[PDB]
Amino acid sequence: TSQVRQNYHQDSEAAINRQINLELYASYVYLSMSYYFDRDDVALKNFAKYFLHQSHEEREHAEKLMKLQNQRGGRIFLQDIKKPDCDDWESGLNAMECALHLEKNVNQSLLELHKLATDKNDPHLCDFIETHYLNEQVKAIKELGDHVTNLRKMGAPESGLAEYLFDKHTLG
Amino acid sequence: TSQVRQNYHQDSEAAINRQINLELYASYVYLSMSYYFDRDDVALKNFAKYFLHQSHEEREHAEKLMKLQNQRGGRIFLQDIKKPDCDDWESGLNAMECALHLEKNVNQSLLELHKLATDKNDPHLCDFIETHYLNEQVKAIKELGDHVTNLRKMGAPESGLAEYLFDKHTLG
Amino acid sequence: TSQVRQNYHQDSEAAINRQINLELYASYVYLSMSYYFDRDDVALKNFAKYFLHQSHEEREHAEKLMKLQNQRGGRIFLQDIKKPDCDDWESGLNAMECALHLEKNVNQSLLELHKLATDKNDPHLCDFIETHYLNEQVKAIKELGDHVTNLRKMGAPESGLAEYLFDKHTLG
Amino acid sequence: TSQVRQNYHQDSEAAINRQINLELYASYVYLSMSYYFDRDDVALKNFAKYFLHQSHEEREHAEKLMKLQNQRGGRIFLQDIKKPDCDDWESGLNAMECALHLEKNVNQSLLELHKLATDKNDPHLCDFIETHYLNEQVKAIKELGDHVTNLRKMGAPESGLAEYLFDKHTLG
Amino acid sequence: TSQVRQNYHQDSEAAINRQINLELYASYVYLSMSYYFDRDDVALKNFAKYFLHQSHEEREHAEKLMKLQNQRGGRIFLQDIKKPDCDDWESGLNAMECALHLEKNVNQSLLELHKLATDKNDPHLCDFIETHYLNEQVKAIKELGDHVTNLRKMGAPESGLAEYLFDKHTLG
Amino acid sequence: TSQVRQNYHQDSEAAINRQINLELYASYVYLSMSYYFDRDDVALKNFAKYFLHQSHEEREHAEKLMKLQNQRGGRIFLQDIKKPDCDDWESGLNAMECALHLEKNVNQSLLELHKLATDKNDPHLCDFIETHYLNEQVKAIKELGDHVTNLRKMGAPESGLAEYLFDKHTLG
């Protein structure tokens, strides 16, 4: 119906809307993580700053997907943003592991989106996904894996000195 | 239970959590409004920029309330962010009127919060609400009323030239 | 025969030559549009400047395709540049609609080229098309759609005040 | 019919349109020459740059003639731009000789145009031709003659060292 | 086994290791070429500088592939770097021809890698190859072809004046 | 045979070629070490940066030896660069110990080279070895010994906090 729509399948539009919702959910999860570490009984300032920065990046990703949906002539349809699975994250290492799991889930969703775009012969959507989302996801997963490895080697759960020093020297 | 908690009633904590959810909902509504005007069949760039700026301000307000909740020793509890009431907003004037209605609703919620804080003899919470939320809400309501009045005088619904010129000269 | 030719099918070379001709034709059409609005009985200076800028961009696109043809070891074969379908364009809105139609035609040609490159297993050609032509085409179509929508809302055909104000405020 | 038309004969308008077409054809020929020397089996970068610069100048000349046609109240009528007479130019010296022949042809056309303008008692058109086209044509012919003479003296056809050194020292 | 591994097939990992070895071999070959021209009985300084620059670029390409292997969770496995096929290269033209042959071989290897990645449905690897290796390879092949053509036209083997002047004017 | 050769014994030329191969092998070993620490399950960025810097320094040493071989009129003869003895280095301390062992081996080779040059009465070669290689080797051995001592005192193998803090404070 749109005057600008060309070679844009409806299934691609629906999948783009789903990815928008997933990105907003990830932003919400990162916000919850960030303000968990601002509590007085946790008090890890650099963890909070890191997760807040991640939350803002996820919001930017969702906005970029919405702009893409408008560019191709599709229609945005927003759903409810579900609350995160946890209220307390119990440690920096546990929050890092949960963030890694969430990023791998988002990467799987993006790979499904790219496969769908390939099946519909939509080169512009494929290139958009490759240029703006796949490499950023790979880099994020690699960085979170590095952080988890360093915290595990330091003795993160049992020794709070480990999380304290990781907060200053790596995330500071 | 918190080592920093002093003169902070549980009802105030619950009301602060509710206000956090309301602020996030307002941010979501403004994001929906902003990307409605980025569509090719609406194409009002300055309306979209205005509503995106409003959305970012609402997110900042929610983050400030979360910081306040952490400062006093309360615990943040997040709920689902409901999707906005509308998908298409049908005009700049209608979106402005809906934004005015939403801001008046938020002002009523903040006034209820202030009354609750007064009843519990919590001067810090009362002053926080007065300093950071009440005057900003009054200014926002006044500005939205001015915009609605100008659009109505210009003939906003029937004449698209009115919305075009308002987009360039007022919001540009 | 070329010492640099590798994995470059002849059908791809022929399609590249055809795309070169199409780009030059689009440049010619935009030049005709630009100097239509420089007439004393039309006198829309910013429309003329916009279409001249589009013409120069199309010439750049054709030159880039010729450079690509030389890079892979193919041979450029030029054809006649057909004169545009119209010499008088009758309004800014009509010229914008014709430009939108032309850009959608060029996008369809580029999509056919990308499909042909995919069928021949030529990743370099596919990436070249994706990187330099597909997103620019999508952006151009979106911008032309926005312009057409704004002109239609203002009342572009019947009211010359609409085209006058669009010339100053949007294209100026 | 034009409100600005004064002392502008129809034959002059037709001849101006013909000159516009000739200028566009010359631009096309120079583009073909320029990308002939970008081939890997020719590989004379400075020859290609020289001919591309000539092509851009010819396009500017055509645009100036179109502006002149609009200034006097005549109507532009575009024809097909014929493809150049050759695909391969076989040497720098041969391309230079062909460019010299083309420029002398364009000079003859401009002299016929000036004679026609003189016969119709149109001083503005005569002065426009004298100021913007005749001296530039004479300078171009002189420069091309100098280049042809130097290439012939160096032994351009048989010795490729001649064309190599001319590319670096004269056109570089 | 890696915590960051996702959608990364083992055959892709093995092919990445093979490409790493090929890149290191190319760097070694270019180093041999570079120091062949530093000999007192050859004494072409700019040829040596050119080939040393190529060697450093190949080392950078190998390091980038190793970084890619670490990013996706694969394991690097290094093999022996074979000595180059020749120790004396006998002329600048012969070295240029051998470099062209080597670059075409590397391009064929990269195309096989891209085909393998496509067959395994690995969009990130495909985009990495397209973004960082395919266009650089095409440009390198085009430049080497240009150099070979110019040297052949000047009379590179029989006339040492040709190689001397090419060393100063093109590679200097 | 070389016109520049003077007081340059064949055994010295062969030993110089062997030292070139040894330097290239050391560069390869350091590259392997550097990218071992870039893995997600090791994740010691500063160790990786240190070993990459060492690898580049070894490549520079090999290039300097090749330049020396060309200066005196000898002929470079390259051999295969053997793959390093290990794939995984298992700790920062173990990699440091292996680097120390490798540097002591290289120092022994250089001392044998200097003794050979002394026996052949070649003062220029002796002074070249003394000026550019012996003191650098002594400094490298001293620095690696310091690093090994500090890691051992910190408790490097059993305690990963030791390697983490050494990575930030010494190598950072």
Short mmCIF file of C-alpha atoms in Angstrom, two decimals, chain D:
data_model
loop_
_atom_site.label_atom_id
_atom_site.label_comp_id
_atom_site.label_asym_id
_atom_site.label_seq_id
_atom_site.Cartn_x
_atom_site.Cartn_y
_atom_site.Cartn_z
CA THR D 1 4.83 33.63 -26.27
CA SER D 2 7.30 34.09 -23.42
CA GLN D 3 6.98 37.33 -21.46
CA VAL D 4 10.78 37.78 -21.54
CA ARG D 5 11.34 37.05 -25.24
CA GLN D 6 12.76 39.99 -27.21
CA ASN D 7 14.71 39.97 -30.50
CA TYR D 8 15.10 36.17 -30.35
CA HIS D 9 14.53 34.48 -33.71
CA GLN D 10 13.24 30.91 -33.93
CA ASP D 11 16.16 29.75 -36.08
CA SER D 12 18.51 30.93 -33.34
CA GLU D 13 16.55 28.89 -30.79
CA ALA D 14 16.76 25.76 -32.96
CA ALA D 15 20.49 26.27 -33.52
CA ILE D 16 21.00 26.71 -29.77
CA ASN D 17 19.22 23.39 -29.16
CA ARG D 18 21.43 21.71 -31.77
CA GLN D 19 24.56 23.14 -30.11
CA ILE D 20 23.34 21.82 -26.74
CA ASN D 21 23.05 18.34 -28.23
CA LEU D 22 26.51 18.64 -29.80
CA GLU D 23 28.05 19.67 -26.47
CA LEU D 24 26.44 16.72 -24.68
CA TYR D 25 27.73 14.40 -27.41
CA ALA D 26 31.26 15.77 -26.95
CA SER D 27 30.98 15.16 -23.20
CA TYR D 28 29.96 11.55 -23.89
CA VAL D 29 32.89 11.06 -26.29
CA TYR D 30 35.34 12.39 -23.71
CA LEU D 31 33.89 10.07 -21.05
CA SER D 32 34.42 7.11 -23.39
CA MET D 33 38.00 8.23 -24.05
CA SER D 34 38.67 8.67 -20.33
CA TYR D 35 37.54 5.21 -19.34
CA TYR D 36 39.36 3.62 -22.28
CA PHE D 37 42.67 4.62 -20.65
CA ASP D 38 41.60 3.21 -17.26
CA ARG D 39 41.72 -0.33 -18.68
CA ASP D 40 44.37 -2.67 -17.30
CA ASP D 41 45.88 -3.31 -20.75
CA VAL D 42 46.25 0.44 -21.43
CA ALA D 43 46.83 1.83 -17.93
CA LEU D 44 47.58 5.51 -18.60
CA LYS D 45 46.12 7.21 -15.53
CA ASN D 46 46.89 10.81 -16.50
CA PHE D 47 45.34 10.42 -19.96
CA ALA D 48 42.18 9.16 -18.26
CA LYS D 49 42.18 12.08 -15.81
CA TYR D 50 42.70 14.57 -18.65
CA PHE D 51 39.82 13.20 -20.72
CA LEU D 52 37.49 13.02 -17.70
CA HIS D 53 38.24 16.69 -16.99
CA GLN D 54 37.44 17.51 -20.62
CA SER D 55 34.14 15.60 -20.30
CA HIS D 56 33.14 17.63 -17.25
CA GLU D 57 33.99 20.87 -19.06
CA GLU D 58 31.79 19.86 -22.01
CA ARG D 59 28.90 19.11 -19.65
CA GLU D 60 29.36 22.57 -18.14
CA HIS D 61 29.26 24.13 -21.62
CA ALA D 62 25.99 22.34 -22.40
CA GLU D 63 24.47 23.51 -19.11
CA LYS D 64 25.51 27.09 -19.87
CA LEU D 65 23.83 26.91 -23.29
CA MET D 66 20.65 25.60 -21.63
CA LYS D 67 20.75 28.51 -19.19
CA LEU D 68 21.15 30.90 -22.13
CA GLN D 69 18.13 29.33 -23.84
CA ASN D 70 16.04 29.86 -20.70
CA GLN D 71 17.30 33.44 -20.29
CA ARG D 72 16.06 34.61 -23.69
CA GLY D 73 12.67 32.89 -23.44
CA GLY D 74 13.35 30.03 -25.83
CA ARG D 75 12.37 26.44 -25.12
CA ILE D 76 14.86 23.61 -24.67
CA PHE D 77 14.19 20.49 -26.75
CA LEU D 78 16.49 17.55 -26.05
CA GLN D 79 17.37 14.80 -28.52
CA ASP D 80 19.13 11.46 -28.21
CA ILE D 81 22.80 11.56 -27.25
CA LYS D 82 24.49 9.37 -29.85
CA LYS D 83 27.08 6.85 -28.72
CA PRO D 84 30.69 7.68 -29.68
CA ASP D 85 32.14 6.49 -32.96
CA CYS D 86 34.73 4.20 -31.35
CA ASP D 87 34.98 1.76 -28.44
CA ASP D 88 38.79 1.37 -28.36
CA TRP D 89 41.01 4.36 -29.12
CA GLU D 90 44.20 2.32 -29.67
CA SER D 91 46.73 4.88 -28.36
CA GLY D 92 47.10 8.19 -26.59
CA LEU D 93 48.13 9.86 -29.84
CA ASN D 94 45.07 8.54 -31.70
CA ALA D 95 42.75 9.70 -28.90
CA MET D 96 44.42 13.13 -28.96
CA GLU D 97 43.96 13.37 -32.74
CA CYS D 98 40.30 12.37 -32.46
CA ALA D 99 39.78 14.96 -29.71
CA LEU D 100 41.37 17.61 -31.94
CA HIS D 101 39.07 16.65 -34.81
CA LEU D 102 36.03 16.79 -32.51
CA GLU D 103 37.00 20.21 -31.15
CA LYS D 104 37.48 21.58 -34.67
CA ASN D 105 34.02 20.26 -35.58
CA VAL D 106 32.54 21.98 -32.51
CA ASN D 107 34.34 25.20 -33.47
CA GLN D 108 32.84 25.04 -36.96
CA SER D 109 29.38 24.58 -35.45
CA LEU D 110 29.91 27.59 -33.17
CA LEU D 111 31.08 29.71 -36.11
CA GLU D 112 27.93 28.77 -38.03
CA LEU D 113 25.88 29.73 -34.97
CA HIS D 114 27.63 33.11 -34.75
CA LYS D 115 27.05 33.77 -38.46
CA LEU D 116 23.36 32.94 -38.04
CA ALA D 117 23.11 35.28 -35.04
CA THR D 118 24.82 38.04 -37.02
CA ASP D 119 22.39 37.61 -39.92
CA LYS D 120 19.42 37.98 -37.54
CA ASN D 121 20.84 41.14 -35.88
CA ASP D 122 21.07 39.59 -32.40
CA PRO D 123 24.00 41.31 -30.64
CA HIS D 124 23.44 39.61 -27.27
CA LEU D 125 23.72 36.11 -28.75
CA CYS D 126 26.80 37.12 -30.76
CA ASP D 127 28.50 38.52 -27.66
CA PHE D 128 27.55 35.44 -25.63
CA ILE D 129 29.15 33.16 -28.22
CA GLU D 130 32.26 35.34 -28.43
CA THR D 131 32.68 35.67 -24.67
CA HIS D 132 32.11 32.08 -23.60
CA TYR D 133 32.86 29.72 -26.46
CA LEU D 134 35.12 31.00 -29.26
CA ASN D 135 38.30 31.72 -27.30
CA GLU D 136 37.94 28.57 -25.20
CA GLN D 137 37.63 26.57 -28.43
CA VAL D 138 40.71 28.25 -29.91
CA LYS D 139 42.72 27.53 -26.75
CA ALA D 140 41.56 23.90 -26.68
CA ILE D 141 42.53 23.39 -30.33
CA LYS D 142 45.95 24.95 -29.71
CA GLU D 143 46.59 22.74 -26.66
CA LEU D 144 45.51 19.56 -28.46
CA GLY D 145 47.74 20.46 -31.39
CA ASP D 146 50.67 20.94 -29.02
CA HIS D 147 50.02 17.54 -27.43
CA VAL D 148 49.76 15.82 -30.82
CA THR D 149 53.00 17.44 -31.99
CA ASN D 150 54.88 16.40 -28.85
CA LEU D 151 53.61 12.81 -29.04
CA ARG D 152 54.52 12.58 -32.74
CA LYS D 153 58.03 13.91 -32.08
CA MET D 154 58.59 11.46 -29.22
CA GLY D 155 57.49 8.55 -31.43
CA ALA D 156 54.15 7.90 -29.73
CA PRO D 157 52.66 4.99 -31.75
CA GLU D 158 55.61 2.61 -32.05
CA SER D 159 57.37 3.44 -28.76
CA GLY D 160 55.28 2.99 -25.63
CA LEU D 161 58.02 4.65 -23.60
CA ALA D 162 57.00 7.86 -25.39
CA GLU D 163 53.39 7.65 -24.20
CA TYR D 164 54.54 6.62 -20.72
CA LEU D 165 56.83 9.65 -20.37
CA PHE D 166 54.25 12.00 -21.89
CA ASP D 167 51.74 10.70 -19.34
CA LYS D 168 54.05 11.54 -16.42
CA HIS D 169 55.73 14.77 -17.52
CA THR D 170 53.07 16.60 -19.55
CA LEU D 171 49.71 15.28 -18.31
CA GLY D 172 50.90 14.44 -14.78
#
